[PDB]
């Protein structure tokens, strides 16, 4: 299975009430392993997973130092953008940054990313070739010319195809029992009587990892996409995820519906039926 490593950064300006809030988190696939909170007392990068705790002090002092530097960058960016858009110093704005790499099942570099957003909208992003940029608007183009002129893309390329993939591999290795595991979902159905001539059939998939999963309903082998109530995959709080798909079934028709669960943790897809 292919994997990925990603770092997410959120910086929020609090006009008249201190420095902006800066939150940074790192992930390997769907498992968080580090975090940083500018409002936290420690002021250090902290571990959020078992397999990273065994990194020595050098690692923690290094990432803390670099995360603090990231924080400082987003602190200056907020002001730059505030001016690029001629905005009041009273309003609260948000800048987001995301960068990382994906490797194939062969653990080799597949693609790299480095995107940036302002108040929820794309601002600038590195293109797949890792040499050109996608400037959202007019303000974004000023940054693009400056990153072009400074040869920013070239440096990110070195990081995304080198360090990023190398540490991803190291992490995948150090956390084998975790990151390289495949937790099949626990499944079941619930039957609730809507009224007299109908009932809601809900298909459950629980305690599964990674998050990716496909849960669909069928009537006589026909896809019920449009008639399926499908929720957003949520976290259990213990590293596993949960999800459900439901449909309304006319009386005496439970036999016609099948629930199909596709997940990497399954030896073969599952076909559940109320019975």
């Amino acid at each position: 299975g292919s994997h990925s490593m990603r770092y997410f950064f959120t910086s929020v300006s609090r006009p008249g009430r201190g420095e902006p809030r800066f939150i940074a988190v790192g992930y390997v696939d769907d498992t968080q392993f580090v975090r940083f909170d500018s409002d936290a007392a420690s002021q250090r990068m902290e571990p959020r997973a078992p397999w990273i705790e065994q990194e020595g002090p050098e690692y923690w002092d290094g990432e803390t130092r670099k995360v603090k530097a990231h924080s400082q960058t987003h602190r200056v960016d907020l002001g730059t953008l505030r001016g690029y858009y001629n905005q009041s110093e009273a309003g609260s704005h948000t800048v987001q940054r995301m960068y990382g790499c994906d490797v194939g099942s062969d653990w080799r570099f597949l693609r790299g990313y480095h995107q940036y957003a302002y108040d929820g909208k794309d601002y600038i992003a590195l293109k797949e070739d890792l040499r050109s940029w996608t400037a959202a608007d007019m303000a974004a183009q000023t940054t693009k010319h400056k990153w072009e002129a400074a040869h920013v893309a070239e440096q990110l390329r070195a990081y995304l195809e080198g360090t990023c993939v190398e540490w991803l591999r190291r992490y995948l290795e150090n956390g084998k029992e975790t990151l390289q595991r495949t937790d099949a979902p626990k499944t079941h159905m619930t039957h609730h009587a809507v009224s007299d001539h109908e009932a809601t059939l809900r298909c459950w998939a629980l305690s599964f990892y990674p998050a990716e999963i496909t849960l669909t309903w069928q009537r006589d082998g026909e896809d019920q996409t449009q008639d399926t109530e499908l929720v957003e995959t949520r976290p259990a709080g213990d590293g596993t995820f949960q999800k459900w798909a439901a449909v309304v079934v006319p009386s005496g028709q439970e036999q016609r519906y099948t629930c199909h669960v596709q997940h990497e943790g399954l030896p073969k897809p599952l076909t559940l039926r109320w019975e």
Binding site: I23, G120, K121, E232, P235, A236
Partner: protein, 100 residues
């Protein structure tokens, strides 16, 4: 500026069995900006020891956070999640249903 309304899901970590330690969760997602007020309620009262995951976001930049507290479901106790955000005129309250 962009403003996305938070989606809300109130559920327990494990299947609810009366008298057994569990975790009550409230997952908020797809919202923007990030400032958001999330409380877990027990019979209408705000639960004090509520922790939450580190702020993060999805491919489309919308935020998501997990609020949770340890608890023991009883057959008489009712729980819910009250959320407030700039895209909501009044607090939004979603009840816990052992079947969702």
């Amino acid at each position: 500026m962009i403003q996305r309304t938070p989606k809300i899901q109130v559920y327990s970590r494990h299947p609810a069995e009366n008298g057994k330690s569990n975790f009550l969760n409230c997952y908020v997602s797809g919202f923007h900006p990030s400032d958001i007020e999330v409380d877990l309620l027990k019979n209408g009262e705000r639960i004090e020891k509520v922790e939450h995951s580190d702020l993060s976001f999805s491919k489309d930049w919308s935020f998501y956070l997990l609020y949770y507290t340890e608890f023991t479901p009883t057959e008489k106790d009712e729980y819910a999640c009250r959320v407030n955000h700039v895209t909501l005129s009044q607090p939004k309250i979603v009840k816990w249903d052992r079947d969702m």
